Amino acid sequence: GRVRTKTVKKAARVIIEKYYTRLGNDFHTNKRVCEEIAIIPSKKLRNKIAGYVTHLMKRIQRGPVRGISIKLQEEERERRDNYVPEVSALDQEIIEVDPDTKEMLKLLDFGSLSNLQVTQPTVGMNFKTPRGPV
Amino acid sequence: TPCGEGSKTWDRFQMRIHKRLIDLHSPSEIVKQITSISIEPGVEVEVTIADA
Amino acid sequence: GGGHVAQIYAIRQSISKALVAYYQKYVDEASKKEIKDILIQYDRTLLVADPRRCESKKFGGPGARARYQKSYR
Amino acid sequence: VRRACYGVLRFIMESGAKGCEVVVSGKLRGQRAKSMKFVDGLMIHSGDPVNYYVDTAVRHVLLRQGVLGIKVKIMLPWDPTGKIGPKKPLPDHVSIVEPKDEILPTTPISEQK
Amino acid sequence: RVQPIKLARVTKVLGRTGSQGQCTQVRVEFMDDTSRSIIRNVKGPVREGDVLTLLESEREARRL
RNA sequence: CCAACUUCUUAGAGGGACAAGUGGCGUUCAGCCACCCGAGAUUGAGCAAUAACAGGUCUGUGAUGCCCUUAGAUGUCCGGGGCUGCACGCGCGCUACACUGACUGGCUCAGCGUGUGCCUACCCUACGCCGGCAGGCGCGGGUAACCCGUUGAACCCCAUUCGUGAUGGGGAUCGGGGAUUGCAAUUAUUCCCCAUGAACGAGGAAUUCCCAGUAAGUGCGGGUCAUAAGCUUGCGUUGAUUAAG
RNA sequence: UUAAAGGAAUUGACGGAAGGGCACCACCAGGAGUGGAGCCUGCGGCUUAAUUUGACCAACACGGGAAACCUCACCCGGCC
Ligand SMILES: [Mg+2]
Ligand SMILES: [Mg+2]
């Protein structure tokens, strides 16, 4: 009998989007911010919106919820763009191939242009997983 | 219901009427210029007879 | 107000919390907390008012919940 | 009954109405009565705000056969805060205000006035 | 013939049964070793964890 | 000015409760479950969609179509009578079958609300005296938080009598008398008094309603009302048992 | 002799067809009963000059319908 309706949830996700720096993990202060910054037409859904606002205060300070607010979003510009490594994941200059794929680059005239020490395929033909339910 | 058919339903109409009261030590001539400052159709104001 | 039984619960509540609000004002709350220690663990209702009330009648029965007897045949 | 109801349904909605619906019931073309209703817009039905956001008017039309029944109701807009529409906005929606662009939060600068 | 009337403690209640929501299943422990535990059915309000008395010890639970 | 105050009373504005706080569960989502604090962690209701029913109402309506009758009028009024007539069946109820009681006397607590009217005649009643009761006269008050009224309600409480009996349980049936309303009381309007004192000993199949101030017991007030409630609608009081081809 | 019979899909409604829910106008655990008796009051039947009539879960203390007359329709008379 607790479960909050659409108009309470959609009006509280628009608060936390747009006034996130002015909020906190207390109920009685967030009740007063939304009182002063949003036109609520009664007292009952006022603090019922403010309840779900504080519910999202602890919810998004633990991680990236559907959270288009600035600070959680600008911090992932230091993940997609930052961590470019000082040494590459590609440039190791010691990489392995197989005797058939070196024949592929042999007609590409890249046989001796490369270093490319080879590994051999372990000779079984044990692919194509066994059939039937057990 | 406008007849006897139905399921024994009843509607409950009510009219709450309010009443307030104020004494004054006023002269009975300036009472009218306190009376002539509101139109306010939904009230009913009465002034007590001056003999007290 | 009330009845023969609802008044002696009300005066029981009254004289129990009257000296509590006397002791929170004219002596310290250290004595008050010591005696409200007694008057809470033993049946809390000596200084809190019981909220439940008359719970009005409806238009289909003799009381508020029950109904008149339904007949079919 | 179909030409007359459209001219009135077009006329409420062009006067600035949040929604309206008209029901005309009676002996139409045919000997058994039926009801043509011509709903439009949004209209609330339950609660107390359908006491002052709506006005209802039920009238009768005495024709040569039977009697028709007109039933018109308009849902009134909140906007004017004045003559044509009510105050006290609809209780299930929230008007949030947009904040300002938040210039000068940076490094300190002091004046004397 | 005479079985010892064995008092018994319930662990986790396995939900209602009995085609009318009248009987519940308790899987008692036997008050001598909690290793030795059988599934049983009782009626009335149960209150998980408490102790109930068995006039008969082991026949069957709700199982076709 | 030979006192202040607002606790209780009355409202008015504002506050407060949001699953907010703490543990557990769940995709650590929505949420659920416990506890804390608190007056309260689900008070009770009003409105209430789309599409309908050959549901009910022409006997609510100067809402109304068509048909019928319209002066020896199915219009309207007056006198009388009937809708109450009883071998029977059924439906909502009221009082009961008793000692967890009935009498008699004591002692003690309510809430909701209503009251003199345009036509409209009649309202609620305190006190004082006549009567044994129903009632009757005098004298007031009230258009009402001002008077009835601090609404001295019943149950219950405390004492007395009765003792397992169709009993002092139950009060149907019925005779005689007395009052009040009304133009009129017989086919008893109602009320009062003395008498008469019937079934009924807890109710087969079947079935109804209901989870907390609930059910049930108990009275009280609106409606109807000149006269009047076993009805309904409200109120407290005692209080539980478990388609892009 | 006859204007349909029929096919394939669609939405319904229904199933003594499955799965998931829910409600004391459903049940369980219970309570108070009702159904038995006396009376009150409504309905059918009977009888009647007339016993006016509406309605048969969602009719039956319901037409707010507790009619002495009036209401009042119905029956017996007389006026206007
Ligand atoms: Mg009519
Ligand atoms: Mg006895």
UniProtKB/Swiss-Prot annotation, chain A:
One of its GO terms (cellular component) is small-subunit processome. Gene3D superfamilies: Ribosomal protein S17e-like. Ubiquitinated at Lys-102 by RNF14 and RNF25 in response to ribosome collisions (ribosome stalling). The modification Phosphothreonine is found at T129. It is found in: Cytoplasm; Nucleus, Nucleolus. There is a cross-link at K102 (Glycyl lysine isopeptide (Lys-Gly) (interchain with G-Cter in SUMO2)). One of its GO terms (molecular function) is RNA binding. This is Small ribosomal subunit protein eS17. Belongs to the eukaryotic ribosomal protein eS17 family. There is a cross-link at K102 (Glycyl lysine isopeptide (Lys-Gly) (interchain with G-Cter in SUMO1)). Pfam families: Ribosomal_S17e.
Swiss-Prot record, chain B:
Polyubiquitinated by ZNF598 via 'Lys-63'-linked ubiquitin chains when a ribosome has stalled, initiating the ribosome quality control (RQC) pathway to degrade the potentially detrimental aberrant nascent polypeptide. Deubiquitinated by OTUD3 and USP21, antagonizing ZNF598 activity. Ufmylated by UFL1. It is found in: Cytoplasm. The modification N6-acetyllysine is found at K8. The modification Phosphoserine is found at S26. Component of the small ribosomal subunit. The ribosome is a large ribonucleoprotein complex responsible for the synthesis of proteins in the cell. Component of the 40S small ribosomal subunit. Belongs to the universal ribosomal protein uS10 family. This is Small ribosomal subunit protein uS10. It comes from Homo sapiens. The chain holds residues 68 to 119 of 119 of the full protein.
Swiss-Prot record, chain D:
The modification N6-succinyllysine is found at K18. It is found in: Cytoplasm; Nucleus; Nucleus, Nucleolus; Mitochondrion inner membrane. The modification Phosphoserine is found at S95, S110. The modification Phosphothreonine is found at T106, T107. Changing S25A: No effect on phosphorylation by PRKCD. There is a cross-link at K100 (Glycyl lysine isopeptide (Lys-Gly) (interchain with G-Cter in SUMO2)). Methylation by PRMT1 is required for import into the nucleolus and for ribosome assembly. There is a cross-link at K88, K100 (Glycyl lysine isopeptide (Lys-Gly) (interchain with G-Cter in ubiquitin)). Component of the 40S small ribosomal subunit. Identified in a IGF2BP1-dependent mRNP granule complex containing untranslated mRNAs. Interacts with HNRPD. Interacts with PRMT1; the interaction methylates RPS3. Interacts with SUMO1; the interaction sumoylates RPS3. Interacts with UBC9. Interacts with CDK1; the interaction phosphorylates RPS3. Interacts with PRKCD; the interaction phosphorylates RPS3. Interacts with PKB/AKT; the interaction phosphorylates RPS3. This is Small ribosomal subunit protein uS3.
UniProtKB/Swiss-Prot annotation, chain E:
GO terms for molecular function: RNA binding; structural constituent of ribosome. The keyword Nucleus applies. It is found in: Cytoplasm, Cytosol; Cytoplasm; Rough endoplasmic reticulum; Nucleus, Nucleolus. InterPro entries: NA-bd_OB-fold, Ribosomal_eS28, Ribosomal_eS28_CS. Pfam families: Ribosomal_S28e. It comes from the Eukaryota. SUPFAM superfamilies: Nucleic acid-binding proteins. It is linked to Diamond-Blackfan anemia 15, with mandibulofacial dysostosis: A form of Diamond-Blackfan anemia, a congenital non-regenerative hypoplastic anemia that usually presents early in infancy. Diamond-Blackfan anemia is characterized by a moderate to severe macrocytic anemia, erythroblastopenia, and an increased risk of malignancy. 30 to 40% of Diamond-Blackfan anemia patients present with short stature and congenital anomalies, the most frequent being craniofacial (Pierre-Robin syndrome and cleft palate), thumb and urogenital anomalies. Belongs to the eukaryotic ribosomal protein eS28 family. This is Small ribosomal subunit protein eS28. The gene is RPS28.
